[PDB]
Design a protein around this ligand. Structure first.
Ligand code: CLA
Ligand code: CLA
Ligand code: CLA
Ligand code: CLA
Ligand code: CLA
Ligand code: CLA
Ligand code: CLA
Ligand code: KC2
Ligand code: KC2
Ligand SMILES: CC1=C(C#C/C(C)=C/C=C/C(C)=C/C=C/C=C(C)/C=C/C=C(\C)C#CC2=C(C)C[C@@H](O)CC2(C)C)C(C)(C)C[C@H](O)C1
Ligand SMILES: CC1=CCCC(C)(C)[C@H]1/C=C/C(C)=C/C=C/C(C)=C/C=C/C=C(C)/C=C/C=C(C)/C=C/C1=C(C)CCCC1(C)C
Lengths: 183, 45, 180, 163, 89, 35
């Protein structure tokens, strides 16, 4: 049976080859599509989610002196009409063209999924390769965690009209519900 | 305006009739040999 | 020998147990005078359109697009509230889909000239037809849902025409027909 | 004995006046029976308890409320939405388990692996407990139906009839 | 901002590029692994001998029978020549 | 007046479609020298 789900079987083409494989694939996504393409998608989603979570925290905590102090959703809305979001979209798309080229290289075997050889510092490149797999595991875990955490953040911001640090400091219930009186 | 179409119902004959005839024409078109011939006109019919 | 659907009428000559959904129900000799592949293709097309139509009847009552003119609870009135250009875009898109699926073979003389099976348009993103018994049971389920959706769409459309009320909306505050 | 009803399943006394087991897979039928029984056990226990405790803050939120009226108030509040979405999340993997069981695996109907207390160590104890679970679940189905229809006729809970 | 300089059009262009790239990337991923698993097959709780289940999937009878025009004439003969009165002979 | 307009539009569309699809049906092949 599967390690993560006791009452399910190991999802066929799902073993220790990819980092963080606890056998969790109840729906046969790894069988409808290639597992390496799905890992590339997962790494892209998780890295963007980690950056988004850190950005949410810092933007709620701090703002640059040349940017209006607004909630992050209001920041997206304000900079869409300001052109900064257009700049971010342009440069991200320019990088992601080569990212898609790398993904097409991944499809025909060759390079590892989500691997861009990006290593400005000497971390698991040389003299530390024995930790690399460990790092990989950590990475995807953080990825997955971020992919949840940011989500909760924004939806909590949608329901309480409070920042995540504001909700932590003042954990009042869902607005209008303490009064209750539904009958 | 447009094709003298001041009422939307006028678009029903202008589309359904050309399509229906086309469907009939399709039964002709599928029957014919649709390969190149390199001639002034196609004698295959 | 007997139909087993109407045990007083004998089995139709062209209705063998090969085709899915076959319980021997053909009191009028349509299968004797029309191609069974064409009949099955027409039945599946009508039923699939009706399944989508019933889902739309429920959803449009439940959810509407924020575009102007798209906010009508009653689907029959929603047809006339939506701009006609969009409906003609839908019609042309569906016609293109039909032509591409049949490959120009839109007549009963040529639609199954290459075979292609009745109702098999090649739409199967998930390989759920690998098992033969599973495929046969799925075909029976599809036919049953198709016929049920045809009847249900007819009922919902006529009741919407009468009451000017959406189906789930009409289920509450029933207000029998003589009230209108 | 009804056709298609072998003795390999626990709780079998050859009871099948209508040939449901002749047209529907017995694995699906037993999975549905166990799920209905467990849901009915939880439902009957909850309907009994809700006439006694009612929790700290539910009293000022829902007023008094009872049974179908409690469902009507709670769907408007939001507890029912949360329960529905979370049990649907669980039932997605339940659907996966049913599909894997029908496709052919070591899984058996009702075997979700939920044995945290290791009460299934003794095999004969588990064999007895399967029948115990089945019969208590069937009794729970009957009792939940009875409580629901008694509330329909009188508007009283399971304890308001007793007390 | 309007047209090719509007940020909404930039977002729409990015979405369109995603849609255009969806077919090659995910089609190739499907070609590598396309539910071609021995355990991958549909399941139905209904018994395979239930009434209405066909003997063979996707049946294509030959139909060496009457033409379409004869069928239409038969359907018209339903309404101008039904077998109602031939019983009283 | 609308019913007359829709009848005229139906008739004109039918005849124009017949003309158009008839001259699309390989009209050049309909000559006595075609083999
Ligand atoms: C998904 C990632 C993401 C996205 C879409 C945004 C988007 C935005 N940020 Mg946020 N931000 C992010 C990540 C992100 N940020 C991270 C990781 C940090 C921590 C350094 C911050 C810290 C931050 C601050 C302090 C401020 C913003 C602000 C803004 C807005 C203007 C852009 C700007 O000046 O950013 C500047 C962002 C950076 C300089 C971070 C570095 C860029 C990338 C993410 C680092 C990549 C690592 C690199 C390869 C090594 C815009 C709404 C400004 C605003 O208007 O707030 C209301 C603002 O004051 N961001
Ligand atoms: C390196 C190339 C480059 C260049 C030339 C620009 C140019 C511009 N960006 Mg930036 N941008 C870039 C890359 C670049 N972008 C990248 C990679 C990102 C992350 C995805 C962004 C994210 C970004 C945001 C979020 C915003 C801009 C904005 C702007 C515009 C306003 C300029 C400004 O603030 O006043 C002049 C600039 C200053 C006063 C800041 C000091 C700059 C110093 C003096 C120059 C240092 C060298 C410079 C960075 C050039 C680097 C390359 C060089 C070393 C070869 C301007 C057209 C803003 C906009 O749209 O306008 C409203 C805006 O909000 N950009
Ligand atoms: C027989 C099918 C049918 C027909 C004729 C219509 C017709 C209409 N719909 Mg409905 N609709 C349908 C099915 C149908 N719908 C289904 C199945 C859904 C559920 C998603 C909806 C949900 C829906 C909404 C939410 C709304 C409409 C609206 C409308 C109107 C404007 C068109 C529009 O914006 O469509 C929008 C419809 C969609 C985007 C859904 C189309 C999905 C298709 C039918 C399924 C294709 C899936 C398939 C597997 C993909 C194959 C790939 C190859 C028009 C009267 C609008 C209106 O005026 O309502 C008051 C509106 O707001 N429709
Ligand atoms: C450009 C548009 C276009 C084109 C070219 C096609 C092309 C085609 N469609 Mg159509 N279709 C389209 C758009 C289009 N579709 C759209 C937008 C819809 C709605 C979603 C449909 C719905 C549809 C259905 C439901 C069916 C087709 C069928 C067909 C095929 C046969 C066409 C034929 O001979 O009918 C020529 C036209 C007719 C024969 C007239 C229709 C017959 C009337 C309506 C029957 C009335 C029965 C009556 C009410 C019941 C008696 C009641 C009793 C009391 C007496 C062909 C491939 C049929 C098919 O594949 O058959 C195997 C089929 O069954 N299509
Ligand atoms: C799934 C199929 C289905 C269902 C559940 C319904 C259900 C209903 N229809 Mg609809 N209807 C259907 C198909 C269906 N119809 C079809 C196919 C048509 C097309 C002809 C209609 C046309 C239609 C009209 C025109 C009207 C209804 C009305 C009604 C309601 C009154 C029922 C009644 O008088 O009982 C009749 C009694 C019996 C059937 C006794 C039961 C006997 C056996 C055991 C069954 C009810 C909600 C009426 C309504 O909404 O009232 C305002 C109404 O005016 N229906
Ligand atoms: C089918 C199962 C089921 C369903 C649909 C409901 C539904 C409902 N219950 Mg009931 N309830 C149940 C089982 C169920 N309950 C059981 C088994 C118990 C005994 C603990 C209770 C005790 C209970 C009380 C005391 C109250 C409710 C209340 C409510 C309402 C709001 C939800 C809530 O806060 O309950 C909270 C319910 C629980 C926390 C019980 C969950 C116990 C689970 C099933 C344990 C599962 C075993 C687990 C794996 C081992 C650990 C709602 C109508 C409230 C209400 O509005 O009534 C006035 C209320 O005050 N329920
Ligand atoms: C555990 C099973 C159980 C128990 C102990 C009871 C007990 C009772 N029922 Mg209930 N009942 C049950 C199951 C049960 N019922 C089921 C399965 C149904 C079918 C839905 C009903 C339908 C039902 C009705 C319709 C009525 C009772 C009534 C009664 C009472 C009269 C007993 C003689 C008694 C309190 C009667 C009563 O007192 O009404 C409140 C009454 O009229 N019962
Ligand atoms: C799935 C079927 C379908 C397809 C395949 C399809 C493709 C395209 C393409 C080709 C890629 C373009 C370029 C395009 C453009 C527009 N479509 Mg669209 N379209 C489809 C369906 C609908 C519906 C149902 C509506 C609609 C609309 C508009 C308007 C608004 C006009 C305006 O601004 O008023 C514009 C510009 C609305 C409408 O025309 O209202 C008057 C409306 O109801 N469309 N559409
Ligand atoms: C985990 C056990 C537990 C469960 C399962 C549970 C379920 C529900 C439901 C579910 C249907 C509703 C709707 C509901 C509503 C309220 N709860 Mg309650 N609740 C639980 C525990 C506590 C505690 C420990 C407290 C508390 C309170 C309130 C208040 C406060 C304002 C008010 O009184 O107006 C309201 C509205 C606080 C309090 O002030 O209680 C008098 C407080 O300390 N609850 N509670
Ligand atoms: C094939 C394909 C796939 C697929 C797929 C899809 C798209 C499946 C979708 C299936 C759907 C939407 C089926 C819908 C059926 C709707 C019905 C039967 C409605 C009945 C209404 C009734 C009975 C009624 C009524 C009413 C009446 C009349 C009047 C009212 O007073 C009362 C009432 C409301 C009761 C996928 C991608 C998954 C995978 C694959 O590789 C290939
Ligand atoms: C007006 C309008 C609205 C919006 C604009 C629009 C699109 C232009 C237009 C729509 C027009 C449209 C799309 C109109 C569509 C109208 C439809 C779909 C009418 C279908 C009616 C179905 C019937 C009568 C089936 C009844 C089943 C029976 C009797 C079953 C019998 C059974 C059998 C044989 C088996 C044995 C058991 C029993 C139960 C006995």
């Amino acid at each position: 049976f599967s390690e993560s789900v006791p009452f399910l079987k190991t999802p066929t083409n799902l073993d220790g080859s990819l980092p963080g494989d606890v056998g969790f694939d109840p729906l046969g996504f790894s069988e409808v599509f290639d597992i390496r393409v799905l890992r590339e998608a997962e790494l892209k989603h998780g890295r963007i989610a980690m950056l988004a979570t850190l950005g949410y925290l810092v933007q709620e905590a701090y703002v640059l002196p040349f940017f209006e102090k607004v909630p992050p959703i209001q920041a997206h809305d304000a900079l869409v009409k300001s052109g900064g979001m257009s700049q971010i979209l342009l440069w991200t798309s320019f990088l992601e063209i080569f990212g898609g080229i790398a993904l097409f290289s991944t499809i025909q075997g060759r390079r590892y999924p989500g691997d861009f050889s990006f290593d400005p510092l000497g971390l698991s490149q040389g003299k530390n390769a024995d930790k690399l797999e460990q790092y990989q595991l950590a990475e995807i875990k953080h990825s997955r965690l971020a992919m949840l955490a940011f989500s909760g953040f924004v939806h909590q911001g949608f329901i309480t009209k409070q920042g995540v640090l504001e909700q932590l400091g003042n954990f009042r219930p869902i607005p209008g519900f303490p009064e209750a009186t539904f009958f | 305006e447009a094709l003298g179409v001041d009422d939307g119902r006028l678009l029903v004959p202008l589309v359904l009739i050309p399509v229906f005839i086309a469907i009939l024409f399709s039964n002709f078109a599928s029957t014919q040999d649709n390969e190149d011939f390199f001639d002034t006109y196609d004698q295959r019919r | 020998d007997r139909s087993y659907s109407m045990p007083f009428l004998s089995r139709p000559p062209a209705l063998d147990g090969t085709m899915a959904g076959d319980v021997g129900f053909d009191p009028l000799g349509f299968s004797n005078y029309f191609d069974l592949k064409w009949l099955r293709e027409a039945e599946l097309k009508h039923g699939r359109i009706c399944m989508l139509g019933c889902l739309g009847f429920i959803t449009q009552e439940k959810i509407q697009l924020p575009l102007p003119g798209f906010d009508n609870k009653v689907a029959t009135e929603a047809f006339f509230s939506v701009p006609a250009g969009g409906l003609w875009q839908i019609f042309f898109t569906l016609g293109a889909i039909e032509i591409l699926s049949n490959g120009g073979k839109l007549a009963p003389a040529d639609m199954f000239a290459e075979g292609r099976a009745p109702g098999d348009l090649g739409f199967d993103p998930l390989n759920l037809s690998g098992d033969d018994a599973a495929l046969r049971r799925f075909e029976l389920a599809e036919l049953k849902h198709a016929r049920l959706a045809m009847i249900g769409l007819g009922g919902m459309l006529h009741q919407m025409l009468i009451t000017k009320q959406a189906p789930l909306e009409q289920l509450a505050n029933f207000q029998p027909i003589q009230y209108y | 004995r009804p056709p298609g009803l072998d003795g390999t399943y626990v709780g079998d006394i050859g009871f099948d006046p209508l040939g449901f087991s002749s047209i529907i897979d017995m694995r699906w039928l037993r999975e549905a029976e166990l799920k209905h029984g467990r849901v009915c056990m939880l439902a009957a226990t909850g309907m009994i308890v809700q006439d006694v405790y009612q929790f700290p803050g539910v009293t000022k939120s829902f007023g008094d409320a009872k049974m179908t009226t409690l469902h009507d108030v709670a769907v408007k509040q939001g507890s029912m939405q949360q329960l529905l979405v979370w049990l649907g999340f669980l039932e997605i993997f339940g659907f996966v388990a049913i599909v894997q069981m029908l496709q052919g695996s070591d899984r058996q109907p009702g075997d979700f692996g939920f044995d945290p207390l290791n009460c299934a160590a003794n095999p004969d104890a588990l064999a007895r407990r399967q029948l115990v679970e089945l019969k208590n679940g069937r009794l729970a189905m009957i009792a939940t139906a009875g409580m629901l229809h008694h509330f329909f006729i009188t508007g009283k809970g399971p304890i308001q009839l007793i007390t | 901002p309007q047209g090719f300089t509007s940020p909404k059009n930039h977002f729409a262009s990015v979405i369109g590029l995603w849609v255009l790239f969806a077919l090659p990337v995910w089609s190739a991923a499907y070609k590598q692994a396309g539910c071609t698993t021995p355990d991958w097959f549909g399941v139905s709780q209904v018994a395979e001998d239930a009434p209405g289940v066909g003997l063979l999937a996707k049946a294509a009878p030959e139909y060496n029978g009457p033409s379409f025009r004869e069928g239409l004439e038969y359907v018209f003969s339903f309404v101008w020549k039904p077998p109602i009165l031939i019983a009283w002979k | 007046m609308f019913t007359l307009k829709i009848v005229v539009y139906t008739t004109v569309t039918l005849f124009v479609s017949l003309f158009t699809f008839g001259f699309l049906s390989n009209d050049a092949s309909r000559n006595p020298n075609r083999k």
